[PDB]
Amino acid sequence: GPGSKPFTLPILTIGELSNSRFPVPIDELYTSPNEGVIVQPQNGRSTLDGELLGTTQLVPSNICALRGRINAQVPDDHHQWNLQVTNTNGTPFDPTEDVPAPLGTPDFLANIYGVTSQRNPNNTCRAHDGVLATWSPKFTPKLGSVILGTWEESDLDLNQPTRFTPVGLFNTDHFDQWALPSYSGRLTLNMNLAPSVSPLFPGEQLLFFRSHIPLKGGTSDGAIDCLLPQEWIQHFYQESAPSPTDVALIRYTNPDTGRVLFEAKLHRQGFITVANSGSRPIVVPPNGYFRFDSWVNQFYSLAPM
Ligand SMILES: C[C@H](CCC(=O)NCC(=O)O)[C@H]1CC[C@H]2[C@@H]3[C@H](O)C[C@@H]4C[C@H](O)CC[C@]4(C)[C@H]3CC[C@]12C
Protein backbone atom coordinates (compact mmCIF):
# COMPACT_ATOMS: atom_id res chain seq x y z
CA GLY A 1 0.00 0.00 0.00
CA PRO A 2 2.45 2.66 1.16
CA GLY A 3 4.03 4.25 -1.89
CA SER A 4 1.25 2.95 -4.16
CA LYS A 5 -1.73 5.27 -3.58
CA PRO A 6 -3.89 4.90 -6.71
CA PHE A 7 -3.80 7.69 -9.30
CA THR A 8 -7.07 9.34 -10.36
CA LEU A 9 -8.48 12.16 -12.54
CA PRO A 10 -11.32 14.44 -11.35
CA ILE A 11 -14.88 13.83 -12.55
CA LEU A 12 -15.32 16.91 -14.77
CA THR A 13 -16.73 17.35 -18.29
CA ILE A 14 -15.25 19.75 -20.84
CA GLY A 15 -17.85 22.38 -19.87
CA GLU A 16 -16.60 22.11 -16.25
CA LEU A 17 -12.90 22.83 -16.98
CA SER A 18 -10.77 26.00 -16.79
CA ASN A 19 -7.72 27.17 -18.73
CA SER A 20 -4.52 27.19 -16.65
CA ARG A 21 -2.78 29.86 -18.78
CA PHE A 22 -5.53 32.55 -19.03
CA PRO A 23 -8.47 32.94 -16.56
CA VAL A 24 -11.34 31.70 -18.76
CA PRO A 25 -13.21 28.39 -19.37
CA ILE A 26 -12.00 25.69 -21.75
CA ASP A 27 -13.72 25.84 -25.16
CA GLU A 28 -12.50 22.68 -26.97
CA LEU A 29 -9.82 20.02 -27.26
CA TYR A 30 -7.25 20.65 -30.01
CA THR A 31 -4.28 18.91 -31.66
CA SER A 32 -1.54 20.20 -33.96
CA PRO A 33 2.09 19.37 -34.83
CA ASN A 34 3.28 22.96 -34.17
CA GLU A 35 6.02 22.23 -36.70
CA GLY A 36 9.18 24.10 -35.77
CA VAL A 37 7.96 25.75 -32.54
CA ILE A 38 9.25 25.10 -29.02
CA VAL A 39 6.29 24.51 -26.68
CA GLN A 40 7.40 25.61 -23.21
CA PRO A 41 4.55 27.27 -21.27
CA GLN A 42 5.28 28.22 -17.66
CA ASN A 43 1.71 28.45 -16.31
CA GLY A 44 -0.35 25.26 -16.20
CA ARG A 45 2.63 23.02 -15.37
CA SER A 46 2.59 20.14 -12.85
CA THR A 47 3.86 16.62 -12.48
CA LEU A 48 1.19 13.93 -12.19
CA ASP A 49 2.20 13.41 -8.52
CA GLY A 50 1.43 17.04 -7.68
CA GLU A 51 4.60 19.17 -7.92
CA LEU A 52 3.78 22.53 -9.51
CA LEU A 53 6.43 23.80 -11.96
CA GLY A 54 7.41 27.03 -13.70
CA THR A 55 5.30 29.97 -12.54
CA THR A 56 2.28 27.75 -11.78
CA GLN A 57 0.12 28.45 -8.68
CA LEU A 58 -3.30 27.20 -7.58
CA VAL A 59 -5.70 30.18 -7.55
CA PRO A 60 -7.55 30.56 -10.88
CA SER A 61 -8.11 34.33 -10.60
CA ASN A 62 -4.36 34.95 -10.06
CA ILE A 63 -3.48 33.59 -13.53
CA CYS A 64 -2.02 36.54 -15.51
CA ALA A 65 -2.80 38.91 -12.61
CA LEU A 66 -0.37 41.35 -10.97
CA ARG A 67 -0.27 43.09 -7.58
CA GLY A 68 1.99 45.83 -6.25
CA ARG A 69 2.39 49.57 -5.65
CA ILE A 70 3.14 52.33 -8.19
CA ASN A 71 6.22 54.26 -7.09
CA ALA A 72 6.31 56.82 -9.94
CA GLN A 73 4.76 58.00 -13.20
CA VAL A 74 7.09 58.18 -16.20
CA PRO A 75 7.90 61.92 -16.53
CA ASP A 76 7.85 62.18 -20.34
CA ASP A 77 4.90 59.82 -20.98
CA HIS A 78 2.10 60.24 -18.44
CA HIS A 79 0.32 57.18 -19.86
CA GLN A 80 3.03 55.00 -18.24
CA TRP A 81 3.24 53.94 -14.58
CA ASN A 82 6.04 51.99 -12.82
CA LEU A 83 4.55 49.05 -10.85
CA GLN A 84 6.73 47.56 -8.08
CA VAL A 85 5.35 44.03 -7.84
CA THR A 86 4.50 41.74 -4.94
CA ASN A 87 3.16 38.20 -5.11
CA THR A 88 -0.45 37.88 -6.21
CA ASN A 89 -1.26 36.37 -2.80
CA GLY A 90 -0.03 39.61 -1.21
CA THR A 91 3.29 38.40 0.21
CA PRO A 92 6.48 40.25 -0.78
CA PHE A 93 8.24 38.97 -3.88
CA ASP A 94 11.61 37.31 -3.17
CA PRO A 95 13.73 37.46 -6.37
CA THR A 96 16.06 34.82 -4.89
CA GLU A 97 13.28 32.18 -5.03
CA ASP A 98 13.90 29.38 -7.52
CA VAL A 99 11.22 30.28 -10.08
CA PRO A 100 11.29 32.16 -13.39
CA ALA A 101 9.12 35.08 -12.14
CA PRO A 102 6.37 35.78 -9.56
CA LEU A 103 3.88 32.91 -9.65
CA GLY A 104 1.02 33.66 -12.05
CA THR A 105 2.98 36.08 -14.26
CA PRO A 106 1.89 35.91 -17.93
CA ASP A 107 3.93 33.39 -19.95
CA PHE A 108 3.44 34.76 -23.50
CA LEU A 109 4.24 37.85 -25.55
CA ALA A 110 1.25 40.17 -26.07
CA ASN A 111 -0.47 43.49 -25.47
CA ILE A 112 -2.83 42.32 -22.70
CA TYR A 113 -5.93 44.49 -22.18
CA GLY A 114 -7.01 44.80 -18.54
CA VAL A 115 -7.93 47.02 -15.60
CA THR A 116 -5.66 48.66 -13.01
CA SER A 117 -7.46 49.24 -9.69
CA GLN A 118 -6.62 50.69 -6.27
CA ARG A 119 -8.09 50.98 -2.75
CA ASN A 120 -6.55 53.35 -0.18
CA PRO A 121 -6.69 52.89 3.62
CA ASN A 122 -9.59 55.37 3.83
CA ASN A 123 -11.44 53.22 1.24
CA THR A 124 -11.29 55.77 -1.59
CA CYS A 125 -10.88 53.85 -4.85
CA ARG A 126 -10.16 54.21 -8.57
CA ALA A 127 -9.78 51.96 -11.62
CA HIS A 128 -8.75 52.51 -15.26
CA ASP A 129 -8.44 50.25 -18.30
CA GLY A 130 -5.18 49.92 -20.18
CA VAL A 131 -2.51 47.52 -21.44
CA LEU A 132 0.24 45.29 -19.99
CA ALA A 133 2.94 44.89 -22.68
CA THR A 134 4.82 41.69 -21.84
CA TRP A 135 7.27 42.31 -24.74
CA SER A 136 8.42 45.71 -23.41
CA PRO A 137 12.02 46.22 -22.27
CA LYS A 138 10.46 47.44 -19.00
CA PHE A 139 8.60 44.13 -18.40
CA THR A 140 11.06 42.84 -15.79
CA PRO A 141 8.93 41.03 -13.19
CA LYS A 142 11.80 38.79 -12.00
CA LEU A 143 13.63 42.03 -11.07
CA GLY A 144 10.51 43.31 -9.29
CA SER A 145 8.98 45.79 -11.74
CA VAL A 146 6.80 46.19 -14.84
CA ILE A 147 5.26 49.12 -16.74
CA LEU A 148 1.49 49.64 -16.96
CA GLY A 149 -0.04 51.87 -19.65
CA THR A 150 -3.39 53.66 -19.41
CA TRP A 151 -5.38 56.24 -21.37
CA GLU A 152 -5.85 58.01 -18.01
CA GLU A 153 -2.98 60.40 -17.28
CA SER A 154 -3.72 61.67 -13.74
CA ASP A 155 -6.08 59.55 -11.55
CA LEU A 156 -3.79 56.80 -10.21
CA ASP A 157 -2.16 57.25 -6.79
CA LEU A 158 1.44 56.55 -5.76
CA ASN A 159 2.28 54.16 -2.89
CA GLN A 160 -1.20 52.60 -2.66
CA PRO A 161 -2.25 48.95 -3.13
CA THR A 162 -2.76 48.21 -6.84
CA ARG A 163 -4.06 45.20 -8.82
CA PHE A 164 -4.08 44.41 -12.56
CA THR A 165 -7.05 42.27 -13.70
CA PRO A 166 -6.49 40.74 -17.18
CA VAL A 167 -9.35 40.64 -19.71
CA GLY A 168 -7.89 39.66 -23.09
CA LEU A 169 -5.79 40.86 -26.01
CA PHE A 170 -5.77 44.59 -26.79
CA ASN A 171 -4.56 43.98 -30.37
CA THR A 172 -2.48 41.30 -32.11
CA ASP A 173 0.82 43.22 -32.20
CA HIS A 174 3.60 41.00 -30.81
CA PHE A 175 1.11 38.19 -29.96
CA ASP A 176 2.70 34.71 -29.92
CA GLN A 177 1.36 32.23 -27.35
CA TRP A 178 4.55 30.13 -27.40
CA ALA A 179 7.08 33.01 -27.10
CA LEU A 180 8.20 33.43 -23.50
CA PRO A 181 8.78 36.92 -22.09
CA SER A 182 12.29 37.84 -20.98
CA TYR A 183 11.40 38.00 -17.29
CA SER A 184 14.54 39.98 -16.33
CA GLY A 185 14.68 42.14 -19.47
CA ARG A 186 17.13 42.53 -22.30
CA LEU A 187 20.35 40.45 -22.37
CA THR A 188 19.47 38.22 -19.37
CA LEU A 189 18.51 34.54 -19.60
CA ASN A 190 15.38 33.14 -17.95
CA MET A 191 16.01 30.81 -15.02
CA ASN A 192 14.29 27.80 -13.45
CA LEU A 193 12.03 27.14 -16.44
CA ALA A 194 9.72 24.19 -16.82
CA PRO A 195 11.04 22.21 -19.81
CA SER A 196 9.74 22.16 -23.36
CA VAL A 197 7.42 19.30 -24.32
CA SER A 198 6.98 17.31 -27.53
CA PRO A 199 5.77 13.90 -28.72
CA LEU A 200 8.45 11.25 -28.28
CA PHE A 201 7.00 8.40 -30.41
CA PRO A 202 6.25 8.35 -34.16
CA GLY A 203 2.72 9.23 -35.21
CA GLU A 204 1.85 11.22 -32.09
CA GLN A 205 0.97 14.88 -31.49
CA LEU A 206 0.29 16.96 -28.40
CA LEU A 207 -3.34 17.26 -27.25
CA PHE A 208 -4.28 20.68 -25.85
CA PHE A 209 -7.14 22.17 -23.81
CA ARG A 210 -7.91 25.31 -25.86
CA SER A 211 -9.64 28.61 -25.13
CA HIS A 212 -10.40 31.51 -27.52
CA ILE A 213 -9.76 34.62 -25.40
CA PRO A 214 -11.26 38.11 -25.93
CA LEU A 215 -9.74 40.59 -28.40
CA LYS A 216 -10.58 44.29 -28.31
CA GLY A 217 -9.94 44.89 -32.02
CA GLY A 218 -8.53 43.02 -35.00
CA THR A 219 -8.62 39.52 -36.47
CA SER A 220 -7.52 36.45 -34.47
CA ASP A 221 -8.81 33.16 -33.09
CA GLY A 222 -7.27 34.25 -29.76
CA ALA A 223 -6.06 30.72 -29.10
CA ILE A 224 -4.44 29.95 -25.73
CA ASP A 225 -3.57 26.23 -25.44
CA CYS A 226 -2.77 24.67 -22.06
CA LEU A 227 -1.23 21.27 -21.32
CA LEU A 228 -3.45 20.48 -18.28
CA PRO A 229 -6.67 22.20 -17.16
CA GLN A 230 -6.39 24.11 -13.89
CA GLU A 231 -8.66 21.62 -12.10
CA TRP A 232 -6.33 18.69 -12.87
CA ILE A 233 -3.38 20.61 -11.37
CA GLN A 234 -5.47 21.36 -8.27
CA HIS A 235 -6.44 17.67 -8.05
CA PHE A 236 -2.88 16.32 -8.33
CA TYR A 237 -1.63 18.80 -5.70
CA GLN A 238 -4.18 17.43 -3.22
CA GLU A 239 -3.83 13.73 -4.08
CA SER A 240 -0.03 13.36 -4.34
CA ALA A 241 -0.26 9.86 -5.93
CA PRO A 242 3.10 8.39 -7.06
CA SER A 243 3.78 7.63 -10.73
CA PRO A 244 5.22 4.09 -11.18
CA THR A 245 6.06 4.52 -14.90
CA ASP A 246 6.62 7.31 -17.43
CA VAL A 247 3.09 7.28 -18.87
CA ALA A 248 -0.51 6.74 -17.77
CA LEU A 249 -2.98 5.42 -20.36
CA ILE A 250 -6.21 7.46 -20.18
CA ARG A 251 -9.53 6.98 -22.01
CA TYR A 252 -12.26 9.49 -22.85
CA THR A 253 -15.36 7.74 -21.55
CA ASN A 254 -19.12 8.19 -21.59
CA PRO A 255 -20.07 7.62 -17.92
CA ASP A 256 -23.65 6.55 -18.69
CA THR A 257 -22.91 4.09 -21.51
CA GLY A 258 -19.34 3.11 -20.65
CA ARG A 259 -18.40 3.60 -24.31
CA VAL A 260 -14.77 4.61 -24.77
CA LEU A 261 -14.36 7.21 -27.51
CA PHE A 262 -10.54 7.43 -27.76
CA GLU A 263 -7.35 6.91 -25.75
CA ALA A 264 -4.28 9.03 -25.02
CA LYS A 265 -0.95 9.04 -23.18
CA LEU A 266 -0.67 11.21 -20.05
CA HIS A 267 3.03 11.79 -19.39
CA ARG A 268 4.65 11.96 -15.94
CA GLN A 269 5.86 15.53 -16.44
CA GLY A 270 2.36 16.78 -17.24
CA PHE A 271 1.18 16.71 -20.87
CA ILE A 272 -0.90 14.56 -23.23
CA THR A 273 -0.16 12.97 -26.61
CA VAL A 274 -2.52 11.25 -29.08
CA ALA A 275 -2.10 9.21 -32.28
CA ASN A 276 -3.27 11.84 -34.78
CA SER A 277 -2.10 14.03 -37.66
CA GLY A 278 -2.84 17.59 -38.74
CA SER A 279 -4.26 20.67 -37.05
CA ARG A 280 -7.87 20.17 -36.01
CA PRO A 281 -10.31 20.63 -33.12
CA ILE A 282 -11.72 17.51 -31.50
CA VAL A 283 -15.46 17.32 -30.75
CA VAL A 284 -16.31 15.19 -27.71
CA PRO A 285 -19.68 14.32 -26.10
CA PRO A 286 -20.64 16.97 -23.53
CA ASN A 287 -21.12 14.32 -20.82
CA GLY A 288 -17.82 12.45 -21.13
CA TYR A 289 -14.47 12.81 -19.39
CA PHE A 290 -11.02 11.21 -19.29
CA ARG A 291 -10.54 8.26 -16.91
CA PHE A 292 -7.32 6.59 -15.78
CA ASP A 293 -6.91 3.08 -17.24
CA SER A 294 -3.40 1.70 -16.51
CA TRP A 295 0.31 2.58 -16.42
CA VAL A 296 2.31 1.92 -19.62
CA ASN A 297 5.65 2.96 -21.16
CA GLN A 298 6.76 5.67 -23.57
CA PHE A 299 6.69 3.25 -26.52
CA TYR A 300 3.07 2.02 -26.12
CA SER A 301 1.13 2.11 -29.41
CA LEU A 302 -2.16 4.01 -29.14
CA ALA A 303 -5.21 3.32 -31.25
CA PRO A 304 -5.53 6.14 -33.83
CA MET A 305 -8.15 8.79 -33.12
C1 LIG B 1 4.24 51.16 -22.27
C2 LIG B 1 3.98 50.12 -23.36
C3 LIG B 1 5.31 49.59 -23.93
C4 LIG B 1 6.12 50.61 -24.70
C5 LIG B 1 7.53 50.17 -25.06
O6 LIG B 1 8.28 49.64 -24.25
N7 LIG B 1 7.90 50.41 -26.30
C8 LIG B 1 9.21 50.04 -26.79
C9 LIG B 1 10.34 50.87 -26.24
O10 LIG B 1 10.09 51.93 -25.63
O11 LIG B 1 11.51 50.46 -26.41
C12 LIG B 1 3.01 50.62 -24.45
C13 LIG B 1 2.74 49.57 -25.54
C14 LIG B 1 1.29 49.78 -26.01
C15 LIG B 1 0.85 51.11 -25.36
C16 LIG B 1 -0.64 51.46 -25.29
C17 LIG B 1 -1.37 51.29 -26.64
O18 LIG B 1 -0.69 51.99 -27.69
C19 LIG B 1 -2.82 51.77 -26.57
C20 LIG B 1 -3.01 53.16 -25.94
C21 LIG B 1 -2.61 54.28 -26.90
C22 LIG B 1 -2.84 55.67 -26.35
O23 LIG B 1 -2.43 56.69 -27.24
C24 LIG B 1 -2.08 55.79 -25.04
C25 LIG B 1 -2.53 54.71 -24.04
C26 LIG B 1 -2.33 53.27 -24.54
C27 LIG B 1 -3.06 52.36 -23.53
C28 LIG B 1 -0.83 52.87 -24.70
C29 LIG B 1 0.01 53.05 -23.42
C30 LIG B 1 1.46 52.54 -23.50
C31 LIG B 1 1.59 51.11 -24.03
C32 LIG B 1 0.97 50.12 -23.01
Is the domain of 41 the same as that of 75? no
CA 149 to ligand 1 centroid distance, Å: 6
Is the domain of 291 the same as that of 159? no
Is the domain of 213 the same as that of 305? yes
CA 56 to ligand 1 centroid distance, Å: 28
The ligand 1 atom at the shortest distance from the C-alpha of residue 136 is: 6
The resolution, in Å, is: 1.5
CATH number at residue 87: 2.40.30.120
Is the domain of 57 the same as that of 176? yes
Is the domain of 74 the same as that of 102? yes
Ligand 1 first shell, C-beta below 6 A: 79-80, 111, 130-131, 133, 136-138, 147, 149-151
Domain of residue 117 covers: 63-170
Is the domain of 154 the same as that of 187? no
The ligand 1 atom at the shortest distance from the C-alpha of residue 132 is: 32
* DSSP line for the chain: -TT-PPP------GGG-B-SSSSSB--EEEEE--TT--B--SSS-B-TTS-B-TT--S-GGGTT-EEEEEEEE-TT-TTEEEEEEE-TTSSPP-TTSSSSSSTT---SBSEEEEEEEEE-TT--EEEEEEEEETTSTT-BGGGTEEEEEES-SS---SSSEEEEEEEEES-STT-BTTPPP-TT-TT----SPPPPB---STTEEEEEEEEE--BSSS----EEEESS-HHHHHHHHHH----SSSEEEEEEE-TTT--EEEEEEEETTTEEEEE--SSEEE---TT-EEEEEEEE-TT--PPP-
Instruction: Tell me how many domains the chain contains.
Output: 2
Last residue of a domain, one of 122, 144, 170: 170
